[PDB]
Every structure is written in structure tokens, then in C-alpha cells.
Design a binder for this molecule. Sequence first.
Ligand SMILES: Cc1cc(=O)oc2cc(O[C@@H]3O[C@H](CO)[C@@H](O[C@@H]4O[C@H](CO)[C@@H](O[C@@H]5O[C@H](CO)[C@@H](O[C@@H]6O[C@H](CO)[C@@H](O)[C@H](O)[C@H]6O)[C@H](O)[C@H]5O)[C@H](O)[C@H]4O)[C@H](O)[C@H]3O)ccc12
Ligand SMILES: *[C@@H]1O[C@H](CO)[C@@H](O)[C@H](O)[C@H]1NC(C)=O
Ligand SMILES: *[C@@H]1O[C@H](CO)[C@@H](O)[C@H](O)[C@H]1NC(C)=O
Ligand SMILES: *[C@H]1O[C@H](CO)[C@@H](O)[C@H](O)[C@@H]1O
Ligand SMILES: *[C@H]1O[C@H](CO)[C@@H](O)[C@H](O)[C@@H]1O
Ligand SMILES: *[C@H]1O[C@H](CO)[C@@H](O)[C@H](O)[C@@H]1O
Ligand SMILES: *[C@H]1O[C@H](CO)[C@@H](O)[C@H](O)[C@@H]1O
Ligand SMILES: *[C@H]1O[C@H](CO)[C@@H](O)[C@H](O)[C@@H]1O
Ligand SMILES: *[C@H]1O[C@H](CO)[C@@H](O)[C@H](O)[C@@H]1O
Ligand SMILES: *[C@H]1O[C@H](CO)[C@@H](O)[C@H](O)[C@@H]1O
Length: 363
Amino acid sequence: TATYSGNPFVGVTPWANAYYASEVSSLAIPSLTGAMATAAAAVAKVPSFMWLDTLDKTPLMEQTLADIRTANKNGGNYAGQFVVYDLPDRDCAALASNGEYSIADGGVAKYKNYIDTIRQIVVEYSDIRTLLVIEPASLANLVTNLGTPKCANAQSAYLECINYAVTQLNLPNVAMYLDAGHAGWLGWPANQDPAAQLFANVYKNASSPRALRGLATNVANYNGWNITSPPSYTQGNAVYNEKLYIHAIGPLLANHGWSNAFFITDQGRSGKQPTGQQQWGDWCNVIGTGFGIRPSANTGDSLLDSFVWVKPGGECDGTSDSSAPRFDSHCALPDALQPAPQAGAWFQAYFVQLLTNANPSFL
Ligand SMILES: Cc1cc(=O)oc2cc(O[C@@H]3O[C@H](CO)[C@@H](O[C@@H]4O[C@H](CO)[C@@H](O[C@@H]5O[C@H](CO)[C@@H](O[C@@H]6O[C@H](CO)[C@@H](O)[C@H](O)[C@H]6O)[C@H](O)[C@H]5O)[C@H](O)[C@H]4O)[C@H](O)[C@H]3O)ccc12
Ligand SMILES: *[C@@H]1O[C@H](CO)[C@@H](O)[C@H](O)[C@H]1NC(C)=O
Ligand SMILES: *[C@@H]1O[C@H](CO)[C@@H](O)[C@H](O)[C@H]1NC(C)=O
Ligand SMILES: *[C@H]1O[C@H](CO)[C@@H](O)[C@H](O)[C@@H]1O
Ligand SMILES: *[C@H]1O[C@H](CO)[C@@H](O)[C@H](O)[C@@H]1O
Ligand SMILES: *[C@H]1O[C@H](CO)[C@@H](O)[C@H](O)[C@@H]1O
Ligand SMILES: *[C@H]1O[C@H](CO)[C@@H](O)[C@H](O)[C@@H]1O
Ligand SMILES: *[C@H]1O[C@H](CO)[C@@H](O)[C@H](O)[C@@H]1O
Ligand SMILES: *[C@H]1O[C@H](CO)[C@@H](O)[C@H](O)[C@@H]1O
Ligand SMILES: *[C@H]1O[C@H](CO)[C@@H](O)[C@H](O)[C@@H]1O
């Protein structure tokens, strides 16, 4: 059954998609030998989320769901995993990940069309449970980066567009998780309450959509789930890992009118702790990282629906080239792996790093 009550990760198996599998098999594996090559084939079988970072990625979502329908007709019990990620003036506090739509060029109307396209796909594939992460680095930017003109000027559009996404994708086979930053972003004491207030306000404003299950944390970041020692870059914070973060924010959501909110947490690049970060705010292509806890609904935690791999390891965070378009200074930092291609492009040396440092190990 595609429909569900409670945890949408229970009773299904997340599908490992062909897009990442193709990247690994055709961009990574030909450069690897022996033990590394075998291990890499195994990484491609770990389910990670497919990012709908352009409208012309929607045909690939459809293909993925088509593959799943076939597998499920043949005895499979698989679920699709996708990231909705195409807001106008996207990624407003950074320069690396600017998208195809802008508010000044009819971006809100274009975003609504993009959402409409996704809704039609989800309607077609009502037979497949569909797990969605909604708009990484959008709402979190509204909590801490209204001092960035691009974010301030986007605030109204973000809220309109996110409302449209969560209402229009509010369907019986869907579970949505709003992106909610991470321990080192919104876990800071002064950021917790405003963050919770914003998430609960989005939820209430959308008429409390039943398909809106909760929040996604650590997306495209590196924090440990439940590491027992605070890394040096966490500066003595109470909230120094994702478990502490969700247990801090969870009750605050309930306080602000969002009860029964649950979480998923990206561990795709969290295997090696501490990481190579020299400042907690360093997010771009972080050195000394590894593949982390494998996706599982067996979390041993009251609030965590599932460990997930949202950001696909190997896919770049942003270019390190000062002369290239979409260059962000964060990607040139001592703790950012050099030289890096455009955001989303394959970054072979980074994949190798993740594989070498994987915990649990693939080798
Ligand atoms: C010292 C101190 C004190 C205090 O009180 O508060 C703070 C708060 C701090 O927070 C820091 O805030 C910054 C923002 O100012 C955060 O930076 C943001 O980090 C996120 C990751 O956590 C970055 O996300 C990137 O962009 C997107 C995902 O949204 C990804 O790009 C896409 O990847 C897809 C899959 O491969 C592709 O399909 C797509 O084509 C591609 O574009 C990218 O990989 C991801 O890295 C965001 O850009 C960035 O602004 C920081 O995390 C947080 O710690 C710090 C210190 C405090
Ligand atoms: C509430 O929803 C409306 C559309 O019904 C939208 O324009 C607005 O941005 C939302 N406000 C908040 C605070 O989420
Ligand atoms: C952390 O979580 C993992 C996965 O659930 C578990 O195996 C491990 O025992 C946990 N460690 C601690 C200290 O809670
Ligand atoms: C969705 O609806 C189906 C109806 O077949 C139920 O079996 C399931 O429990 C879920 O609520
Ligand atoms: C998801 O589907 C897989 C295979 O279809 C199972 O191994 C798992 O138990 C879950 O039903
Ligand atoms: C599978 O898909 C990947 C990602 O689009 C390509 O890099 C590869 O060539 C193959 O077509
Ligand atoms: C790409 O294809 C290879 C085989 O060519 C697999 O081993 C890998 O898992 C991925 O699907
Ligand atoms: C990765 O992509 C290539 C095409 O560039 C395929 O031939 C290969 O089998 C894998 O899917
Ligand atoms: C895989 O990586 C090697 C370097 O290890 C390259 O030479 C090759 O082109 C592919 O990117
Ligand atoms: C890694 O190990 C596998 C065994 O599963 C071999 O098939 C391959 O040649 C590689 O060395």
C-alpha cells in the first residue's frame, strides 16, 4: 500500500536511483581498481535522494517512479525519494547553487508550474509511496540571513512558494519533510526558537497538511548523528550533533502549534567525526569526511523516522575556481577540497575521500 499512517519509512524499502548509479558506474568506477572499484559499486546500491534541481529533471523523476512501479509489480516494495529544490532566487545566502528561476523574471509563477509538474507525476504514480525533502537552505536562511539582500528580497517569494509546494504536494502517497538546517546552523541557542516558530508557522499557514510529516536536518551537511564528544569547531554548544538538535527543536514545534512532527537526518557525508572543518559554518566540499550511517528506519530514536542520504556523495557543493561563475569564497577555504567543479557536477576526488573514510566501511 502506498498510503501510510505514522512513519512513512515503515513498510517500504527506499529505491536506489539510476542517476546516481550511472554517475558512480560511469564517472567513478572507470578511475578505480580492485578493492576500491568493488566498494564503489556497493555505494551505488545505497539509496540516496534524487534532486529535482531543474524543471527538466522532472522526466527523470518520472523514469524513476516508472522503474519502481515495474519493480513493485514484480514483488518489490519500494518507495521513491526526491528533493524539491528550485525556488526562485534559490540558495540566497550563497553563490554556488543559484538556480534557473529568479523573482524578478516571473520566478514565482515559474516555480508554481514546476510544482504543478511534480504534482501531476505524483498523481500518476499514486501507487508509489513518495518521500520528499522540501527546499534545502531556504527557510533556514530566513532565520539567520535576512541581512543578506538576496534573502531579504526573497523572503516573501520563499514563503509563498513553500506554501504552494506543501499544499499542492499534500497527497495520500506523499510524506514531506521541510528542510530545517542543522545543529551548527539553527541549534545555536538564539536560533532555536525563531526557527521553530517559522517551521510551525509554515505548517499552520498551509492548513496543517497531513502529508507534511516534519523536518529534514543536516541536508548536504556533515554533523554527526549521535557522536558522544563535541568536535572542537562546535565551540562548547549544548547542541553539537543532530540527535541533540532534533530533540531541542521537536518540543519547540509542539509549543508553536505543530504537534507530532518527526525528523529525517542526512548522514551521507557524516561517517568521519570530527570532520576536517576548521569553522562550523564551513559547508563547501568539506575535507576529511566519509559516507556515514546507512539509510534505515531502525533509528533507536523517538523522533527520527529514518537515517537518510539526501545529498549524494560525490556530487559537488560548489566550484573552487575564483574565475568561474557561481564562485563562493567558502569553496576556497582551507577545509574545502580543491579543485572543485560546479555545484552538482561530479567531483571524483571527493567521492574517493568519502569512500576511503566511510564508516560503516565499504572496504
Ligand atoms: C558562530 C555562529 C553563531 C551563531 O549564533 O549562529 C551560527 C550559525 C551558523 O550557520 C551557518 O549558516 C550558513 C548560512 O549563512 C550555512 O551555510 C549553508 O549551508 C548549507 C549546507 O548546510 C548549504 O547548502 C548547499 O546548497 C545546496 C543544498 O541546498 C547543495 O547544492 C546542490 O546539490 C544537489 C545535489 O548534489 C544538486 O542537485 C544541485 O545541482 C546543487 O546545486 C549544496 O551541495 C549544499 O552544500 C548552503 O549553500 C549554505 O549557505 C551553514 O551550514 C551554517 O553552519 C554558523 C555559525 C554561527
Ligand atoms: C501563507 O500562505 C500564503 C498563501 O496562502 C502565502 O502567500 C504566505 O507567504 C504564507 N505565509 C507564511 C508566513 O508562511
Ligand atoms: C548512535 O546511533 C547508532 C545507530 O542507531 C547506534 O548504533 C549507536 O549505538 C548509537 N550510539 C550512541 C552513543 O547512542
Ligand atoms: C492508506 O489507505 C489504505 C487503504 O487501502 C490503508 O490500508 C492504509 O492503512 C493507509 O492508511
Ligand atoms: C522493502 O522492499 C524490499 C524488497 O522489495 C524488502 O527487502 C524490504 O523488506 C522492504 O519490504
Ligand atoms: C548515467 O547518468 C549520469 C548522470 O546524468 C551520466 O554522467 C552518465 O554518463 C550516464 O548517462
Ligand atoms: C553502475 O553500474 C555498475 C555495473 O556496471 C554497478 O556495479 C553499480 O552498482 C552501478 O549500478
Ligand atoms: C554509465 O554511463 C555510460 C554512458 O556514458 C554507460 O555506458 C554505462 O553503462 C553506465 O550506465
Ligand atoms: C576518474 O579519475 C581519474 C583520476 O583518478 C581520471 O583520470 C579520470 O578521467 C576519471 O575522472
Ligand atoms: C572487488 O571485489 C569484487 C568481489 O566482489 C571483485 O569482483 C572485483 O574484481 C573487485 O576486485
